[PDB]
Amino acid sequence: FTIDSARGIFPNTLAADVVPATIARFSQLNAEDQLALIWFAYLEMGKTLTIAAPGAASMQLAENALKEIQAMGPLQQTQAMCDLANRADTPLCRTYASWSPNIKLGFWYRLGELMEQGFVAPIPAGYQLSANANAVLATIQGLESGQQITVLLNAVVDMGFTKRIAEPVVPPQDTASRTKVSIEGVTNATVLNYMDNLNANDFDTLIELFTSDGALQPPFQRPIVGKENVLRFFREECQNLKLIPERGVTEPAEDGFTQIKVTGKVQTPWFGGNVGMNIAWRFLLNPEGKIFFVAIDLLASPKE
């Protein structure tokens, strides 16, 4: 069997496909409505949830692009933000496209602050969203917080126009300091080592758990295949998570493989303990215990 056929394991896991549905609707909107909608969502979410500050290295990497926009006159600033949302082919859009998700997020965090302050052209006063756009924002505001932040993440990542620029890799947590997870029902060493090395930012140890051709599938994305690609993903995108697995189930699979599904919560360093996303992991392990495939799913509700 293939990586792609393995996507079908635990086929009855209830993934939150309202998230990609909602991003698809969002993507249909006119660019100015896209930007206003996110401005509205950001302002209202900010009443009860504060975004962590972007890292210093991140801000340094986005600094030249931010300066360029801040130096523009107001009509030109608005046009540059529209170019990003439209995925137009421009130098700024190409630069944005070369960035990891964290750098893109930190770029918009800083523009958000500047718009609140009046230093970068704000959404026009009294702006009203289009018919479709107001419905999309209603949908977003009805979602669990973990689903809301995932919609915003995808909206930010999808902007710009397609060299890879990412933050420096943090040193792994010192061995003495590491905590170990406990999962009801699951003593599988590979699963436990996966969770514990990821919580420690120990990506060189983590990648060693994979088969050479192994894949990792993030929520709502295609599998990332092979150790080179999966390690790059870990280093660019997977730093400083907190995985909090709760319970699991272990079953035999074809050809002497084992499949394990674990559910629990995950926190992103952008929100710390203020947002706990509901997550399932679905592992397919070969006979030696190596990870041939792991999918990470955002779940439809805690009921999942």
Add this chain to the structure above:
Amino acid sequence: TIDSARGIFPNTLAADVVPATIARFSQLNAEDQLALIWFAYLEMGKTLTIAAPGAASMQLAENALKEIQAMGPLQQTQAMCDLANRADTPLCRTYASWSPNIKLGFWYRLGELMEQGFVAPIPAGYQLSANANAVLATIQGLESGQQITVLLNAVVDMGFTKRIAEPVVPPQDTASRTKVSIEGVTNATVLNYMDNLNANDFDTLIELFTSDGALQPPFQRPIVGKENVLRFFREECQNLKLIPERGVTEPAEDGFTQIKVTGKVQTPWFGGNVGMNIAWRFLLNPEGKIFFVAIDLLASPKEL
């Protein structure tokens, strides 16, 4: 901008449940994607018959169909999964070179063969996953015009990315042409647009556009410039019946005029058995040329 013009009549109520539903579909495991379509196809076929693919189309897909028919059953199932997964294989590359009609004709013939048992069918008694059953429920709840647009997009999105299309039909003889009538709208450019498209007269039709003008099909990005728009007309827009009903005409910036028309459109795949609810949004420059036209599938007849 072309992109800023996407915002005209911003309050037109597009059926964004269609791209939402496509996004959810696209998350599914490949075998569930194929079974789901098989199920929708079978149930829709009890009240709607798909027109036969044209002879030229069938000839163009003939070699790929023969190759699949020659495979043993496990390999046929694998080939159809490769298509649904967008895997990189020769068959997937060939499929991706085809226009939508050729892809549709390829699946129409495989559908007939699966019904007959000559090509590996969906396993007897197959049950969809949790997410997949919800996706199919959504589809079955949509208007028929929205259902067929979902199936069209699912078919078009398969394969892996030379352009192969059916031959262009000769324009309808002029003595035989009918003329549309639109309540409220006597604009010659809008009327010539509808009438030339209904006559398959793409050379005359393209002449209504500005050099840099664009056409935006339902839920797709603008197709920009006369070369690209004419190619689109010739590959994809043959044998439609546009039945505009009424419209509204307003001034726009820089001496332009914007016109929105609503009505129905029939595709030759279903003839008069499916009438899709459609809006056209035109932006015409001061000389009457089309700078931008968007074609939208509407959320319900209540948007007409």
